[model samples]
Every structure is written in C-alpha cells, then in structure tokens.
Target: LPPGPTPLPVIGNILQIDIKDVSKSLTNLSKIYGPVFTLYFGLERMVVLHGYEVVKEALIDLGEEFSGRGHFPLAERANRGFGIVFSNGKRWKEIRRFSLMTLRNFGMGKRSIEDRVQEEARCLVEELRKTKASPCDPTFILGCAPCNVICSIIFQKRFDYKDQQFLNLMEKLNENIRIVSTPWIQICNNFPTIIDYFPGTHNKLLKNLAFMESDILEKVKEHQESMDINNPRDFIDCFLIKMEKEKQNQQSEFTIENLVITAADLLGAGTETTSTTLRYALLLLLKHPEVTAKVQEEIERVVGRNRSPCMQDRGHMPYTDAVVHEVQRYIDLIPTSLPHAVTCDVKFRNYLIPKGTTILTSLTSVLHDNKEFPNPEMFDPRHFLDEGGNFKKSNYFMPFSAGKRICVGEGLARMELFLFLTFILQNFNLKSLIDPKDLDTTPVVNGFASVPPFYQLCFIPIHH
Candidate 1:
C-alpha cells in the first residue's frame, strides 16, 4: 500500500485526521502520501483514491473489483442489508437492477416522470408566489418538491407543501442527514457496539430511522391492499408484483422487509442531494445576479414565458446548461463519495489490497482539479463552456460520481435540477435577503456532504 500518516494502536489515524473536514484532511495527506494511500477509521483500513486518474481507473476501468460498497456501522444499523445502498453480492445486484429499471420505467411509463417534475415545479413556483417576495428560506420549501417527486414514483402520489405529515417526513430526513454527517457519528458508527452504552446522537438517529421506517411500512401496507399486477401503480406496486411472482422460491430476497428498506433507501438518498442542489443553485444565483441575468437572457432567447421550460431547451441554451453544470461542480456535493470496498484481494498499483478493504474515492479531488478546471476555486460557468460558449462536457465533472456504484437517481436528479432551476429562474427575479457580498457560499458544515449556510432568499415575480 502507498505510505500514509502512521496510525497508533486501537485509535488508528483517528487523531491524525480531521474527521469534520475529511476531504481537506485527505487532500492534505495526499501531498505527503501521493494519490494512493491507506488510512484507517479505527481498525477499518481503506485505500484513499485521490486524483482523477486513480479514481477513474478503479471505478471505470476495473469496474467489478471496486464496485462493492463499504459497509458502515450506521448504514448497517439503519438499513440492515435490506436496501440497495447497503446490500452486497447478489442481493445488491438484484435490488439495484430492479430499482434502476423501476426508476427509468417511471420516466418512460404511462405517466412520464418529467410530468411529475414539471407539475412539482408548477406547485413550487406557486408556493414561492405566495411568499410575495418576502424573505423566505428555500431550504424546506425547496426540499418538499423533490421529496414529493420521490413520493410520486415510490408511492404514486405527491403531498402538499403545507401537509404536516409530509413536512414531518422532511424534518426527519433533515435530522437524519445532520446526525449522520457529524464527526461523532463516525466515532459511534465505527464502534457503535462499544459506544451504545453511552449517550450520543446515534441513539437519536435510531429513533428517527425507526420513525421513518414505520411511516414507509404503513405505505407498504397500503400498497399491499391495492393489488394491480396488470397495471402497477408505482414502484411499490411493481415490487409487490415481483414479490408475488417469486413467493414460491424460498431463497428469494424479495421479502416485504427488503422492500421496506429499499423504499427507505430510494426516498432517503434520492430526495436530499437533489433538494440540496436545488437550494444551493438558488444561493449561487442570488449571490451572483450577473450570472443570473445571463441565464435569464438565454432562457428568453431559447424558451419564453409563453411555455414552461422543457428538456429540449437545455440543448439550445448552452449558457444555462453551463451554469447548471458549474453549480454542481462548484458545490462538490459528495466530497468523499459513499465509500466502496474491494470485491476481492487483488494486486493494484503494485500493492496487495485485501478483500473488503474500504476504498475512498475522493470525488472532490476530481471536481476541483485545477488541471482540468482553470481557477478551480472560482465558481465559473466557463469550466463547462468552450470558447464559442457551447456546453463542453468534462471527463472529471462527476457530481453524481461514476461507474457501476454511481448514484442511481442521477438521471432523475439531473432532470429535476435543470427543469426546476430554469422554470424558477424564468419566472422570478431572485434577491438575497441580506447583502450578497455577506453571503458565504462555502459550506458551514462539511461532513459526508457540503451545503451552503442556511439563509433566506426573496423571489420577486417578473411579468413578461
């Protein structure tokens, strides 16, 4: 293995690294240890895949070997090998394959998922219109739209923004994210069995997970009653159809329990990242009105108030597309992506990686690579734009990660971001509640993900 900061017994490199800012810590370690190195969280050893070439090769070139997700105690406790995100071997393949097919089918099925997104966009715009340009925090408001989209796919419905139960679910999701992202959560997760005796946030996380699962299970019960094998209503219906088909097979992993956790995984991971991006994109736009105006001008030229923005507009409006790409790139949403584990003991980069060694692909290193993106520190749309102002795709712009284990909701997220952003920008003139100069785009909290500091924004409706 490549050399790294020496670890002490039991504690490992826990003290050597800054758990709060792991991306920065890992990046700094790369300067001394090179692109590939071994580090530990407690006794768990992981090979840090920093830089573009290393991450790309492991994930893309050697696809099978590194596709396995590393099991964290937190996920194990909450998910328990039931969901697509936590399961491995054949189970993972089964659920992931089914989940992807189901999601894609939603987009292409009787009711296009795009319609779901567009309708949600209309609702979102109307919700903002109610604010009447008052200081409004888009955090929860932005969050509701994506959550409802996930709901439409998973449960065949969307909830109202003012619906208390739906709002409670969003609140639970936010709490789960906050709890999981703490440095202390890692400590608990790495050694939960030992830490369980003491008072900590993990207990709180367990409570929230139980609460969330209970809600999902209730939905499962509801879907169970409305049997429609011929005409499946939503993801849950389709899953039930498969479960009924496979019931005779004793070894089938398609149990209702697995379905429950899988639904949890879909709704949980699906909603947060997209919703976070939606809110962050607004923060960036309101922070930079000049960039905002350019996007609006492009929108007017390509798509006008006469009709809602469509996916086709993305092709004609390169500047708007570039801005969207730049927002994702600059956010560095998942800095160190969901960890992966090696499938088997293998020789890679002149080192023996034992089976199940945690592989940390530093996605931030790729997204913020100065070589690929000029002045990587600056939030510039030019990173994705050629000299002619056409949208230019980068080999390194992987906000949703890459390869087999890449985010399953990538297609859905991309569509939502483009549609929601363009629709809102086309309809409203955003203004920062405070001076834009005072706003801090830098994430106040950087744990599993980085998000802009919480701040309200005002939306002034613009008439054509």
Candidate 2:
C-alpha cells in the first residue's frame, strides 16, 4: 500500500469514506497521503489518483491500459450488458460508434437540434415569466427544458408540460439515479449476492430501472411502427435501421436490448447532467451579482437582447463563456469518475501497477489543483480569459475527462450548457430568495450528481 491510513479488519476504510461527499473525503486523504494512495473499500483495494499530473498520466498517457469502466453494480443489473457507459470491449465499441453517428445524423450539432433547444428555452423563459419574480425552486423547471431537448432528439416529438406520463417517467428516472449513488447503494455493490435477494435501497433502484426500461421499450415500439424505413427521422429511427442492417451478423451486438439501454443512457445522461449544472450556474450567478451583471452585459453587447444567443455566439461573449467554464470547474461534478480498470500491467514513476487493478481518477482534484488553477477555491472567470478578454483553453479544464473512454456526449453537453446559460442570462435577472450567506452551495447528501443543495430563486424579467 502506498502510504494510507491503515484499514480496520474486514470493513477496511469503509468507515472513513463519506459516501455523501466522497470528493471532499478523497481530497483530505490525498493531502495526508500524497497524490497516489491506496485505500481498501471493503475487500476490494482501490488506488486513487489525484492532481492533474498523476491523473493525466494515468488517464491520457496510459489511455489504452486504463480503458475499462470497472463494474458499476446498478448499471450491470439494469443495463444487462447493453449501453455504452457501463459496457466494455466489443459491445461498448459498436454501440458507442452507432450512438455517436446517430446523434450526428439527427442534427446534434446541426440546425435541427439547435432549433429544438431554442424552442425549449423559449418555453422555459415564458414559464419563468409567469412566476412574476416570486421565489421558486427552479430545479423542476430547469430540469424539464433539457429533458424535453433530449426527448425531442430521441423520440422525434415533444411533450406538453402537463403530460402526466412524461412527468412520471422523469420523476422515476431521477429517483433511480439518486438512489443508485447512495451509501447503501455502494454497500450493495460490494455485497451484490446478498443485496440481490434482500430488500433495501437496491430494490427501489431496481424497480425504477424496470419502469424506465418498460417506458423506453414502449417508445421504441411506437417509433418502429411509425418510422419510414427509407427516411429515418431521429435517433430511435436510426438505431432501428442499424439494428436491421446488423441483424444477420452473429458476431454483431446490435440487439433491441442494446438499443433500449442506449436510448435510456442518452436520455438520462444528457438531461440530468446538463440540467443540474445549469441549475448550479444560475445559483452561483445569483450569489455573485457583479459577475452576473458582467455576463448579462456581455450577452447584451455581443448577441443583443432582441436575438436569442446560440452556441456560435460564445466566441463573441468571452466573459459569459468564462463564467460557464468557471461554473463547471467550481461544481466539479463526478468527483470520482466511473472507475477505470487497468487492461495490462503498467509502471508509473517508481510504482508498478498490475493488470486488472482498478484505478480511480479524481476529476475534482484535477480541476481544483492550485498548481494548474491559480486560485482553485475561488470562482473566477478570468482563469479562462486572457488580459485582453479572449477564451483561453486551460489544460486543467478536463471535466469530460480525456482519452478513448472520455464522455462521448462532450460536444452535445457543451452546446446545451452554452445555449441554455446564455438564453436565461439574456432575458432574466436571477436573484436568490435568501441572502447569499444563507444559500447552500454544499451538495446534497448521497446525491448521484454533485448539484448545489436545493435553493429558491426569483427570476425577474429584465424587460417585461
């Protein structure tokens, strides 16, 4: 073991790890034990890599060696050897390739998706206007717009805000994600055989997964009936067509199960992550009035209030772009990434890591390292801006990770964040209901994603 607190008996370092704020616990441990340290999670040994240099070398330089996403228990059960994020080897490769292509063909970067995003944003702004600046939990409203964006891409249709089925599906999906990241959930992963039979958080998570799976299957069937074989419209259509093309190849893994899981992955991953980030961005902006004002002023000057901003306008609005980058950096979502297992034995500096050893990369530490980011603790947009106010890409800004297994949705996520953030800032002046001091930026307990704790805010229209 490379310098870590000695574990106690069978439980090991399980007691030390705070499942709620795993990133904070890992940060504290790294300070005492250095960047690369070993801690036992029950019987399993985990090697945690901290800071930019260590993490970069492991994830980027030794990319192929660390390509495996080591065993996510819930994902394994729910996905059942389907979908891109959790699966590995041949299945992952084919599904991931197909997904990327389908997304691109369905106007991901093109005008079609951009128009959908704009439409959702328009509805969001109008909904907020109805609130008339009254303090409200923007979580659901923020969540729904992005959910609609992904739904539009996948189903080739949009849902009314009041649609019960749509709302229920969203609620269940969110619940499933939430329960999967809990402490009890992690415990279940460690003791899967027992947990599978026993009743606990795992049961609820499984039920939610089934509900989501059924909902997806129903949508897939609906698309199959309507889709014109020659003229596929959206992602579901594209996927079905591809499935038929690859059906004869016994070696091929393009089954309906894979398609359903992939669709669920795209919809849930795309919607939840972006919506949570934007919610926090607005909260942070409300806390810092000067930063918020400067961003709005930049948007007004570059894109103008009359015209809605697009991802293209990011180049002209340096301050706004910087703010968005800073928000992601400060939030540091997915602190400990979905673990990457070593494919082959590898040597670092003085240490030799064996093949099949699970390696953990601390994205939080890399993003917040003071060496890479001058004042890592502060939320400063200038970190991404030059003295002359141009967007300066920092090597430290690797929120989506890097290498072969990096987030495939990076392009779509960035586009969504930029367009959504700009659209909201341009129209409304957001302010927290409580004083800045009272607002809780600390993440919720046992949350799947690192989102700011629930906070109320009033979005007053800058115009009418």
Candidate 3:
C-alpha cells in the first residue's frame, strides 16, 4: 500500500530486514521511506508504522480499524484462534472484554492484588538474603517473583521458588522465549509453512508448549473439580464459572479448550514481560549506582525503613518514579509489538490497506523518539524528569502500547515494577561484580523480548 524497497522474486524483502534486530532495521528503513512504509515477507505484505505520530495515529486515532490481532505464527499454532493474546474479531473482543473484567476484579483488586505482589516482593527479598551477599546471577529468583504473582491470581496458589515444577516451568518459559527470539524463528515466521515440514528449533518450541499446556491442563482439571459458583478462587475458576453460565449459548467463547489456552496465555504474557523488565531494571541500577543512591534516598525519605514501599509512596518519590519509567522506555520490550492487523479495508493517510493486512507499529521508534526523549540511546532518567525534579509524563511513552489491543496486564505490570523495585532497593545495596563503567548493560537477545545480559550481583542488606 505504501512505498517501500522493491521485492526480489518470492523472497521479497526478507533479506533486507536483518533477523537479529528487526525493530532497529525497520527503524533505519523508516528514515529513508518515511514513517508509513510497506515490507514483504514471502507473499504476505505488512505496513510499518514508525515514530510516535504515525504509530499513535494508526493505533489510537484509527484504533478500531487497526485493533485486529495480526497473525503471530508461533502463538497462532499454539493457540489456534483462541485466547486473548492472538485471537481476532468477535472471539477476541468477547474474551478480551472478559479478561479485562476479570483482571480488573482480581488483578486490580486494590488490596488483594497489591497484597499478592507485596508478599512476593518480601519473599524475593528473603530469597536474595539467602544468597548471603554472595555474587549470584538473578535469572531464576527474579523470574520466580513475577511468575508467582501471576500464579497466585491464575491458579490461586503460589509456588515455592525451589519447587521442582516451578523451576521446570520457568526454565521452559525462558528457553522457549530465547528460541522464539532467535534468527531461525524469525526466518520460520516468514516461512512458517516450510519450517513446519522439517524438524528444527520451531519443533522444540512446540514441544515446550506441549509441556506447558499439559501442566496447565492438570491445573485446569484441578480447578474444574473444585470450582465454586459463588466463590471463584482464581482466573481459571472464574472462567469455569462463566463456562457453566454460558453452556446454553452455542457461540460462547468460554470453553474448557479456551480456558487452558487462556490460562497459558496469562501465564506466558504476565510472567515473561514483567520479570524481564525487573531483570533489566536491576541491571540498570547496578550500572548506575548514582541513580540507585538517589532512589534509595527517596525511599528512605518517603517510605522510611519501617514498612515495605506501597503504591501510595510512589506519588511522593519523583526520582524513583522517573527511574522506573525511564527503565521501561529505555529497555523497549516488545519493540515491534505483537503484530496488529486492520479489521476493515481502511484508507490510512495516502494509502488504502486491505482488511487482514498485518501491521507492525514500531514501539521502539516511539520510545526512542529524538524529540520526546533526547539522546535516546543513552539511559538517563532525566528524560522523564522536569526541572523541578517532578516526574514528567509524555504521550510518546507507549511502553504498554496504545489503544484497545494494549497489554492486558498493564496495571498489574506497573504495580509490580514499582513495588518490587522499591522493596529491593529499600532492603539491599546492589553491588555489581565489575566496575559500573565496565559493566555492560546490553541485552543478549533482541527479538520477541529484550532479554538482559546474564550477570551476577550481590544484594548486600541495608542496615539502619
């Protein structure tokens, strides 16, 4: 629909975009072709919406037309047109509406949800304390906290950090994320049909999914047996209750099949994203001790050493707030955002994009916009801080994305980031293995997720 590099036979523009860093490559292409440009992967054509203005206009201004969930090959094969993350149209809307209602009720349950995260935060501090100030990689422990929070809401049960099942699930999740983000998977996405015919990492990807789904199935069965109509325990219980209510309706989106898939969706979506952000946040703190010192100072002033930091304390601590926002903006997770599609053949700007045409909104472009965030390559909290040292807000801050298809767990995620971070900094003094200047904060993987490089740090307890 829009102008772009001319395709070469069947391969199209696949070779033009680097598989390692699709978002960066796309951002570079946008510089020459302008914000709205086209790219082809095999026979499928996609419109690239770059920059804050272009992305905002397509996602927010024309929200409805661009609200459709584009084809996410990996997730599609696993979910098969079900669940909240990758489904489209009536099914997507209905399930998404229900999910929002449920999350708003349980995940945003003012006291309960916050309490769950608070409990996990305290548990995380204890786990770090167990390390006895010894240098250790925070891969599993950091991953455990957020996963447990999501587990608490979904299954109404939290696993011990050392639990075998919990560890296995976490390992599978991490491995699968890494696999999905690899160059091979990027090629597989473009040629999904061909990849499925031969054995490769994509096969392992499905194998991992099978294990996760089976584990989820066991939990779903457990929930099904003990489900209470008036007293739904967790997300699965609530969905089961809905299934009973909608048993008469033939077109009901709530089903046992959907239940398992949605549970998996929530677990996958809720766990990886927030945990990865937490991991990256810790690295940033380790890299910049000055920022950590300032955050701790604010924590001491506003929250003090008596009680764990709460959501209420966030307002008074501008520096800490700015640091958190800057971390999210700087990391730029889900850079391209899970592909979105146009619901109808809508004329956008100078072109008419046919219905079902996939769209890639460069969240990286928005988060790293030069005008909104000066020298975006550098990690500086001042981008979100004003002259008065107050936390500044910008419309270009679209880490959770914009419009209807934005991350369903945005509220829960923001809460987790603030509370978990404040709790850690309040109790511990982060000491990196190497000098802050020498410590590299570059992400190891820059695909589906921006995974922080594996490094060790000691969390020496803070004494009064």
Candidate 4:
C-alpha cells in the first residue's frame, strides 16, 4: 500500500478526501507516506507522486506507461468518449495528431496566428481604455481577447465584445469549470449513478455541458454552410474536409459530434487558463509597482513605443520574459496536473504500479520546491535569469506539464502571455484602486483552474 492514512471500509479513504484544495492536502499526505504512496478514492486505489523526482519518473521516464487519463464521471459524461484531452487509446491518438496538425496548418506559430493575436490585443487595449482607468474587473476582457484568437482560427471571425451569445457561452464554460473543482463534485464522480438523482453543482454542470454542445453544433452548421472546400480557410473548414474524406472508413472517429466536443474542449482549455494567468499577472504588477516599472523600462528599451511586441521579441526583452515566466511559476495554475492513469503495469522507484491505477503528479510541489527554486514563496523574475541577463530555462518550469500528454497549446499559450503582457505594459501601468493588501491575490476555489479573487484595478495610461 506504500503507506497512507487509514482507509475506512466500503468507502475506503473517500471520506478523508477534500477536493476543494486537493493539491495542498495531497502535499501534506505525501509528507507522511513519502513521495510515492497509495490512497483510495472509493473502491478505486490511486498512487500519488509528490516532488520532482517521483513525478518526473512517472511523467517523463515512464511516459508510455502513464499515458491513459484518469476518468472523472462528469468529464466522461460531458465528453462521451470524445476529444483529445480526455479520450484515450486509438481515438485519442488519431484525434490528437489531427488536431495538432490542423492547429499548425491554421497558423498557430506562424505569422497568420500572430496577426490574429495582435488584432485581439488591440481590441483588448481599446476595451480597457473604455474603462477610462476606472477600477474594473479585467477577467472578461482578458479572457475574451485571447479566446478570440482561437475563435478566429476555428470560426474564421471574431465576436464583438457586446455579443450576448458569446458572453453567455463564456459564463457557462466558467460555471462548468467551477462545478468540476468542488468537493461534492469529486464525490459524484466516484458514485455517479447515486449522485445523478441528487440536485447540486453536477446537475448545473451537466446542463451547461448541454448548452455548450448545442452551441458548438450550431457554429459547426454555420461553418458547413459558409466554408468553401476548394480553399479551406479555418480549423472548421479543415476538419469538415477531413471528416468527408474519412467518412467511408468504418473505424473513423471524425463525426459532427466529435468535432463539436473537440472544439469546445479547445475553447475551454485555451480561454480560462491563459485569461486567469494574465489577470493574476496584472494584479501582481499593480501590487508590485517596482516590478511593473522594471518590465515597462525593459519593453521601452527593447521594442520601443511605435512597434508592436511580437513573440519573437521575447528573446530580446529578457526582463519581460522573466516576469511572464515568474507569473506562471508563482501562481502555479493547476496545483496538480490533471490525473493520469497507467496504461500497463510498471515498476516506478521500486514500487509496482498496476495497469489502470490513477496517478496524480503534484506540479505545485515541483514548481515551488526550494531546492530547484530558491525562496520558493517569493515572486522573483531573477530566478529565471542568468548573471549575464539572458532568459534561463529550468526543468522545474513545467507549467504546461511534461511528456506525451503535455498541453498541445503550449506554444500558442506562451506566445499569447508574452505578447499580451508586453503590449499592455508598454501602454499602461497597472495600479491598485484600493490598498494593495486588500486586493485578494488569493486563489478562488474553482475545479481544475485556479482563479484570482475579484478585485478592481486601474490601467493608468502613461500618456494620460
């Protein structure tokens, strides 16, 4: 059993579990049981790996062995055996490969994607300017801006900020993410059949899931009517063409349903995480005016006022790059990476883990480890810098996670974070409307995503 807290009969360690902040609790548990240990979630047993060494072995060294996803009932029900994030085996492989290729083809790293991101950044700056430096929650503006980049790729157009349908969809997606992170939600995942009859967050989440599915389907229909097969324009156009080409293959997983769900997955994955991090970035900058000033000075010296900041400029702007990297490290979005399951029985650090066993790797521990990062609690950009003033890369900086199942959108996400941070800092200095101490940098309890608590800040323009 690899040593763990005592488990009660029938329910096992389910009652002892706390899902609200599972990562912190798991870290504490690892202290008692050591790095690799076993715990039970209902009848199912899980092996949790804490710290860099153990987690690195499971994810990087034994990547193939731990390739399967740990199925949560809500994810299973919502996705219904579709999408790259949750789907495993042959379906996962084919769809993931096609999705990655499609994203690249549609200019993920290329100039086309950069143009879209820059356009959204301009819209974002305009939207923020409308606030007139008044204290306002930047969540929606930050979220929708980068999200529009993904929307531009998939739908071939961007939605206006005033678009009610788009606003509603974002709200629904946010609600769904919140529901999945609750403690009761974890319970429901273990005992799904019993929990189905109960009225709670899961029910609301399921309803939101339905709404998202329908919304995607409608968008897909719109794409089908408008798209030209001869000159495919966007992700939807490419996906539709591939679906038609592979329609005759009996084992083909490319269907309208899969396409819609995958599209939702991309939006869900793309929007919230990046938006939340940027929100935190702004908040941190406002709280620490000195840091903000340093970043702005770096931007001015490197890119100047007239030229727009691009991803390529990151190498030249070391200070800005360091700040961006530090924001990801200090915030540590997902305390633990999403749970992974072992595909085949394998021995990890003298412990035999059976096939289908769930493993939760504590990414928070790795990112915040004192040995890897000195003064782990402090938000310092110099941690990612060499004495020579160049950006430094660390093995511990696994914000997108590691190995085969690592985030496919990592490149796009990094580019968005860098460009957005640079562009915004160049124009305005983030300032707290209220006392900096009163501003809640403490993370709100959301399901998978960690969001900063609601607080208003002014983006005081340098010119004004």
* Candidate 3 residue lDDT tens string, 1-464: 89999998988897788767778899889889999999988657899999888888889999999999876777777789888888888999988988888887353233367878899999999999999999998877888999999888888679998789898988888888788777777666667777757657777878988889898889899878887777877888878888888999899988888877887888889888998899899999999999999999999999887788998889899999999999999999889888899999989988889999999999999999888899998999999999989989999888999988999999889999999999999999999888988888887546677878888999999997
TM-score of 1: 0.97
After superposition on all C-alphas, the RMSD of every candidate to the true structure, in Å, is: 1.5, 2.2, 1.7, 2.1
RMSD of 3: 1.7
Per residue, candidate 1 scores C-alpha lDDT tens digits across 1-464 of: 76787888878888877766888988998998888999867657789999999998899998899989886888987777889988899899998988888888353248877889999999999998999999988987788999999988888788887888898888988888887887777776566556667656777878888888898889899978976678877888889988989889898888888988898888888888998899889999988989999999999989877989988778999999899999999999899989899899867788788989889999989999999998998899999998888999998988989888989988889899999998899999988878988888887546789878888888899996
**Model 1: how far residue 207 lies from native, Å:** 2.5
Clashes of 3: 0
Off by over 4 Å in 1: 105-109
Put down candidate 4 lDDT per residue, 1-464, tens digits, no spaces: 46677788768776655666777778888878899888887556788889899888888988988888986777887788898889999989888988888877343323377777888888888888999888888888998887787888778678898898778877887787767766677777766665757866666877887887887788889989987777777777888988889989888888888888888889888988888899999988877788889888888888887787887778888888888889999889988788799998887867788888888888988999998899978888988999998899899999898877999788889888988888888888787878866665677645465778777888788773
- lDDT of each model, Cα atoms only? 0.86, 0.80, 0.87, 0.82
How many pairs collide in each candidate, listed in order?
Answer: 0, 0, 0, 1
Ranking by lDDT: 3, 1, 4, 2
What tens digits encode model 2's per-residue C-alpha lDDT throughout 142-164?
Answer: 88888888888888677888998
